[PDB]
Amino acid sequence: LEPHLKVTKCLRLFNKQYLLCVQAKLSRPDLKGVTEMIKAKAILYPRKIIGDLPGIDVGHRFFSRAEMCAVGFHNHWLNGIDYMSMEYEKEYSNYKLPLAVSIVMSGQYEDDLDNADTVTYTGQGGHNLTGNKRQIKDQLLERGNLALKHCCEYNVPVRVTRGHNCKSSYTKRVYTYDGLYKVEKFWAQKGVSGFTVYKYRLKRLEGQPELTTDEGLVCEDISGGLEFKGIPATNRVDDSPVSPTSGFTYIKSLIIEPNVIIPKSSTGCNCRGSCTDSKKCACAKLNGGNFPYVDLNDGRLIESRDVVFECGPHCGCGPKCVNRTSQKRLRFNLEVFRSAKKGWAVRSWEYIPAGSPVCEYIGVVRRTADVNEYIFEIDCPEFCIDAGSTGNFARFINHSCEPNLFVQCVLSSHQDIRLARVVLFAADNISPMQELTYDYGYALDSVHKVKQLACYCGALNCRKRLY
DNA sequence: GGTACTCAGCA
DNA sequence: TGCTGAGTACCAT
Ligand SMILES: Nc1ncnc2c1ncn2[C@@H]1O[C@H](CSCC[C@H](N)C(=O)O)[C@@H](O)[C@H]1O
Ligand SMILES: [Zn+2]
Ligand SMILES: [Zn+2]
Ligand SMILES: [Zn+2]
Ligand SMILES: [Zn+2]
C-alpha cells in the first residue's frame, strides 16, 4: 500500500466530496468537504507527526488548506501553526508540550520575512482576520508561539508550507511543501504596527531537494490552428528536428469509415438555454436524476460513472450547457514534448483541477475486425478508434501505472454504447510542466511465444510491462 | 461541556 | 476594501 498512492486516493476522495458540496450549493465546500472526510474516518494521518509524511514529498503542491487538512498534513483550515496538544504529553515525555509540527507562511502577517532558505516567521495572536489584516494587540508566548519555542529548545523541525498566487484562471492560490525547517532562534519585539510580536527564525535543513525558483521547438502548433489553444511541440532530446505531425493530419472531430454504423440520434431534452432544473431535463433523468458535471471552472466531472449522458444535437439547450462539458474547446495550454524513451508525450503548462476534461480521444472509428500503436478500443469490443494517421493530440498521451488521467465514456449524439465517446478527464489536480498520462489497461500476455513491451512510467508501482 | 482562537476564501 | 467558518485545545464561570 505505497504511501504516495494512499495519498493520491485520499486526495481523490476529498475532491469527490468537495465537488458534491459545490453542486449541493453549500457554503465553503472545501471546509464542508473535509468535514465529510472526518465523518467517514478517511483522513490519511489522523494523529499528528513530527517530520515528513510518507507520500508527501518536499515540493508537494496542495491546492487549498482544505487538502492539507484532508490528508492530515495540517489539521487547521485557518491556523498558521499546527502543533501537538497536551494530549501528546505521555506519548512524548521526553519533550515538553505543546510542540509545533507544521507552519504555513501565507504572507498574511506583516512581520514575516521570507528569504527562502531562511525565514523570520511571526507567531500567532493579535491579528486581524478582516480589515487591513494587521496586528491589533500584543502577542504572548501562549500557543503556537509556545510550541515553536519548544521546537527551538528540543531540536524538533517544522514542516514549512508556502502560499503562492497563480495566473491559472481556475486556480487562484496554491500551497507548496518546501521541507523541514529548524527554529534557529526566537525573540519578542515590537512589530511594524507597534504591538508586541514574537518572531521565530527558521533555517532550512539539508538532506532535502533544493528550493528552485518558481526551447528546442520543432513546431509552433501541432494543431493546424484547429484547437482553441495551440499545442506547441518541442524536442530537446535530439536536434533531430522531425515533427510529431509528420505523416499525420490533425482533426477536431471524429471520422467514420463506411463499414461502421451510425446509430440513431438521441431524442434529447427540451429545456432552453441551459439545463439547470433536473426535474425538467431528460438528460438528467438519463444520468440517474442528477447532472454528472458541476458548474465550476468551466465544468468538472464529479466522479467517474459507467457512461455519462451529455446533452446532444437535439437538446434545446445551447453549447454552454453544463451537461455539454466535454464538448467545449481546449481549456489548457498544453505541450507535446519529446521524452527520452516514451517517444512523444504531452504535458500541461498550467493548472488542471481534478475532474476537468482534458480531451476526447479522436481518430477514425474503424471496426475492430478490420484490424498499430495508436488504437483505442471502445468498451463501456466491436468498434475502435484508429488515431494512426489522423486524429487529435490525444494520441500523444502516454501510459502510466500511476496516471493523472482516467477514461470516461460519454454518450451525446446517440444512445448506443458501442460507439460511445472516449474522453479523458483529470483524475488528480495537475501542476504545470508535469506529464499527463492514463492507464491503458492492457491485460498481460495479450498480444502475440507471447510478446511484451517494457514500461517507462517512472512510477514506483510500475508493473514493468505494458503488455 | 463550553468557547475563544484562527496566516481562508469568498464573490 | 465585508464576514462566516469549523475544529481543535484547553478549561469548567
Ligand atoms: N508507459 C509507456 N512505456 C513505454 N512506452 C509507451 C508507454 N506509453 C506509450 N508508449 C509508447 O507510445 C505508444 C503510445 S501513443 C503515444 C506515444 C508515441 N510514441 C508518441 O509519442 O508518438 C505506445 O504504444 C508505446 O509504444
Ligand atoms: Zn436539458
Ligand atoms: Zn443541455
Ligand atoms: Zn439535453
Ligand atoms: Zn508502468
Spell out the residues 6+ positions from residue A42 whose beta carbon is closer than 8 angstroms to its own: A10, A13
Q: Kindly state the cell numbers that stand for A134.
A: 494587521
**All domains in chain A, ordered by first residue:** 1-77 (no CATH), 78-214 (no CATH), 215-467 (2.170.270.10)
Instruction: Give the resolution in Å.
Output: 3.1
DSSP H/E element including A12: helix A3-23
Distance CA A24, CA A390 (A): 41
| Cβ < 7 Å from strand B, A residues 137-166 | 143-144, 163
Task: Estimate to the nearest angstrom the gap between the alpha carbon of A382 and the chain centroid.
Answer: 33
Smallest CA–C1' separation from A33: which nucleotide? Answer: C6
CB of A456 within 6 A of ligand 1: the answer is yes
Cell triple for A57: 514529498
Cβ proximity of A17 and A66 under 8 Å:
no
Residue of minimum CA distance from atom 14 in ligand 1? A398
Ligand 5 center–CA A443 separation, angstroms: 13
Which nucleotide has its C1' atom closest to residue A97's CA? Answer: C9
Report the alpha-carbon distance of residue A450 to residue A467 in Å, rounded. Answer: 10
User: Whole-angstrom Cα distance, residue A284 to residue A278?
Assistant: 5
CA distances from A194 to A119, A128, A146, A278, A362 (A): 21, 14, 21, 57, 63
Please give the number of the atom of ligand 1 that sits closest to the Cα of A374: 15
CB atoms within 10 A of CB A113: 12
For residues A57 and A75, what is the distance between their CA atoms, to the nearest angstrom?
18
Checking each nucleotide's C1' against the CA of A85, the nearest proves to be: C9
A288 sits in the region (left: phi over 0; alpha: psi -120 to 50; else beta) called left
Nearest CA to ligand 1 atom 20: A344
**Interatomic CA distance for residues A192 and A125, integer angstroms:** 14
Q: Is the CB of A176 under 7 A from strand B?
A: no
Between CA A40 and C1' C2 the distance (Å) reads 34
Cell of A163: 502560499
Q: Alpha-carbon distance A374 to A435, whole Å?
A: 19
CB atoms within 10 A of CB A118: 14
Which residue type is seen at A47?
A: R
A394, A386 in Cβ contact below 8 A? no
3-class secondary structure, A4: helix
The answer to whether strand B lies under 7 Å from the CB of residue A312 is no
Rounded Cα–Cα distance for residues A142 and A450 (Å): 68
Contact residues for A146 (Cβ-Cβ < 8 A; gap 6+): A98
A35/B7 CA-to-C1' distance in Å: 21
Ligand 3 centre to CA of A333 (Å) is 26
Pair A201, A119: CB distance under 8 Å: yes
Residue A255 CB coordination number (10 Å) = 15
